[PDB]
Paper text:
DNMDP and related compounds, or velcrins, induce complex formation between the phosphodiesterase PDE3A and the SLFN12 protein, leading to a cytotoxic response in cancer cells that express elevated levels of both proteins. PDE3A is a well-characterized cyclic nucleotide phosphodiesterase (PDE) that hydrolyzes cAMP, cGMP, and cUMP8,9. Here, we show that PDE3A and SLFN12 form a heterotetramer stabilized by binding of DNMDP. Moreover, we demonstrate that SLFN12 is an RNase, that PDE3A binding increases SLFN12 RNase activity, and that SLFN12 RNase activity is required for DNMDP response.
To gain insight into how DNMDP induces complex formation of PDE3A with SLFN12 and how trequinsin inhibits this interaction, we solved the high-resolution crystal structure of a modified form of the catalytic domain of PDE3A (PDE3ACAT-Xtl) in the absence or presence of DNMDP or trequinsin. PDE3ACAT-Xtl is comprised of residues 669–1095 with two internal loops between residues 780–800 and 1029–1067 replaced with shorter linkers to aid in crystallization and improve diffraction quality of the crystals. The catalytic domain of PDE3A crystallized as a dimer with two dimers in the asymmetric unit. In the DNMDP-bound structure, DNMDP binds in an extended conformation with the dihydropyrazidinone ring buried deep in the active site pocket. This orientation is stabilized by hydrogen bonds with H961 and Q1001 and a series of hydrophobic interactions along the length of DNMDP. F972 and L910 also pack against each of the ethyls of the diethylamino group of DNMDP, which are positioned at the entrance of the active site pocket. Indeed, the melting temperature (Tm) of PDE3ACAT increased by +3 °C in the presence of DNMDP, indicating that DNMDP binds and stabilizes the structure of PDE3ACAT. However, they do not reveal how DNMDP promotes SLFN12 binding, as DNMDP does not cause any obvious structural changes in PDE3A. We hypothesized that the interaction with SLFN12 is stabilized by contacts with the exposed diethylamino group of DNMDP and inhibited by the trimethylphenyl group of trequinsin.
Numbering used by the authors:
A (entry chain B): 669 to 780, 799 to 808, 812 to 1028, 1068 to 1093
B (entry chain A): 669 to 778, 800 to 1027, 1069 to 1093
Amino acid sequence: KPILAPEPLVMDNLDSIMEQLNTWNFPIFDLVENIGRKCGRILSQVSYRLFEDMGLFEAFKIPIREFMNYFHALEIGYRDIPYHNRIHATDVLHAVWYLTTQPIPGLSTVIGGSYVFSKTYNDKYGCLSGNIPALELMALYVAAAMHDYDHPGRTNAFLVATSAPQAVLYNDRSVLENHHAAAAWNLFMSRPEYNFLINLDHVEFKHFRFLVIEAILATDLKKHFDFVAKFNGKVNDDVGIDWTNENDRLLVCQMCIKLADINGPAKCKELHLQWTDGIVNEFYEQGDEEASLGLPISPFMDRSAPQLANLQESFISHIVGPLCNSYDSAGLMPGKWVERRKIYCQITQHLLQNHKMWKKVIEEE
Amino acid sequence: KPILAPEPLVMDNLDSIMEQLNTWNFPIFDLVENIGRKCGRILSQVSYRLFEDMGLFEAFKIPIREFMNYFHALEIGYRDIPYHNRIHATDVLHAVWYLTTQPIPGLSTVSYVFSKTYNVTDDKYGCLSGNIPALELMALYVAAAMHDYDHPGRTNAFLVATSAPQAVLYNDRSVLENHHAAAAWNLFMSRPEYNFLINLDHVEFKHFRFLVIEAILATDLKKHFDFVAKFNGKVNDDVGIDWTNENDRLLVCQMCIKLADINGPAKCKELHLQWTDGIVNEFYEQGDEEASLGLPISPFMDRSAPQLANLQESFISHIVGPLCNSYDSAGLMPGKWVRKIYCQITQHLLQNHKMWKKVIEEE
Ligand SMILES: [C][C]N([C][C])C1=[C][C]=C(C2=N[N]C(=O)[C][C]2[C])[C]=C1N([O])=O
Ligand SMILES: [C][C]N([C][C])C1=[C][C]=C(C2=N[N]C(=O)[C][C]2[C])[C]=C1N([O])=O
Ligand SMILES: [Mg+2]
Ligand SMILES: [Mg+2]
Ligand SMILES: [Mn+2]
Ligand SMILES: [Mn+2]
């Protein structure tokens, strides 16, 4: 049972691709090809680099062996399925790191907590890492790594409709997300070889665990409109986001992991088209099982009647679009001032270009 | 491998106690003595009587063997602990049946079932069973029977503080209540011998399961103040409770199971004192394990320094009192026109509260 990290913990021949981590369109499929498909090390190698970039090993006296042991066991428990795999976990962790470390035009630093900064971070700009304490940031990064742990390649709706043992176990409520959090935490506690949090006190550890669970459970898209309405409520109230309020910080971390989780349509066309391929291939596996069980095939999941452009157009218009508008309205989107100044925002620019590409595909069909 | 209901499905020797089900202070400990203390049939025998009283077997074409098979398997998986046992499950089912079937002064009433006990044909009474469709009522009754299934005799706080497997499995959220619902439903789906819902269509069955889970999860007292504030909100808004609104009906069913679950302090002194003895004895078992694990003993859980009166006074003042006041303000409390209203349930709660305050005054 004690899966341990490969002998040379840090792989070391990957420097030329790893130095591109500080870009939004990090070429993650070129990293996969450089490491080796199913070498099972992409998540632990990127986790190492981003924890070191933030000085999180010093801040919490994290021993590197136990940390690499855990992140390797975690990445090994992600299945070989087309989308909800360790490559997606790596992508989401990169996205949360990018959203929390990169310059945000006109964001104020909380006047007055222990805070970490990226080595990449060097009046007119702030970053979330300057407003969210190191403990809470580390919880968000670990949540991103564990968020899809042991994903079966089926939706909550499918597990509930088929009375899958997991759906009965979790009373049909956030079935996958409860399982990811519970299975990742059970893995963590199963062996002292995994205990990278040994230097947190008991109060800190219980708070850390609470924050990780809240972040993973926030990735259930059945709650998507509830989180977005709650967040628009906090932004448009008397004081706006209050960075000294622990519940306001939690809600920002949850919006951050939610955006990170569905970042694909807001990447360059090349990345977005590869992730689109991944999710529709996982849907077709589900559509095949639905047919074999005599259920009707869910919309967009029938390989012999694809509606790929309709899926991505409506995903962008109903889910990704409103989440980005809400996050941008809070003033939390990384961007650059244009030389009542305007902001150039790469993330919304990509989402707009991808939306237009899918509408153009629809108008031909 | 399947637990099956005992030889003659219905015990014939219980008639003189079973006819007293239509009283608030049902002598449940006399029923225990008449059956035998761990005979393990009390929940299935009472469930049969209350389902037959409401004509629920005819309304959903329930096969009685599968129904008795399931309720016997369920009652067997309640542990021999002092409070959260099959006797408590029986008590809560009786209380939800009583609150939903018995006359309510000035309640308006319209796929509905009615108790054979419901006589009193004065215009000026209704019952909730006249306002809550039979499918939703049956969900509330089955939830009451399953609400504490496989209870370990420990609080959520103890399971979370000790990183018990169940607390890890449920991410520290409503750990016991998720387990009761999940373990009860797993038992149901485990055997065709248990499928008493076979004549519900697929839409009905999915709705039924949703309602049962919502009712069991509502018994977590971490949510108590949220439910009470939400209910007072719906009662004091422009239209009040709207019986044609499915979310208003669910919230009434959840207030009903919540009151049924903590009914003890609103029973006659004799019943209330036996239930109080049960809960403090279960707490002491928890305090013993806390000491052995080197944890500080939780408040009220120390056998060598009991604080029974302080426990019950503050439980009634903080939890039971405000829930009864809120349910009574909605006009949903069973009672009799004297015209003012005599309400047995609130009169018992007031008398038991005064009894504990008087005990404290000596200590
Ligand atoms: C129903 C939402 N959903 C299932 C979990 C989903 C997940 C991810 C993506 C997805 N689409 N485009 C990408 O670039 C990659 C991911 C974010 C799309 C959907 N969807 O059903 O539409
Ligand atoms: C606070 C909730 N609780 C422990 C889970 C509890 C349950 C039942 C009773 C109990 N009190 N009085 C009775 O008559 C029987 C039951 C409801 C009391 C408590 N409590 O901690 O106060
Ligand atoms: Mg997920
Ligand atoms: Mg309970
Ligand atoms: Mn994900
Ligand atoms: Mn109970």
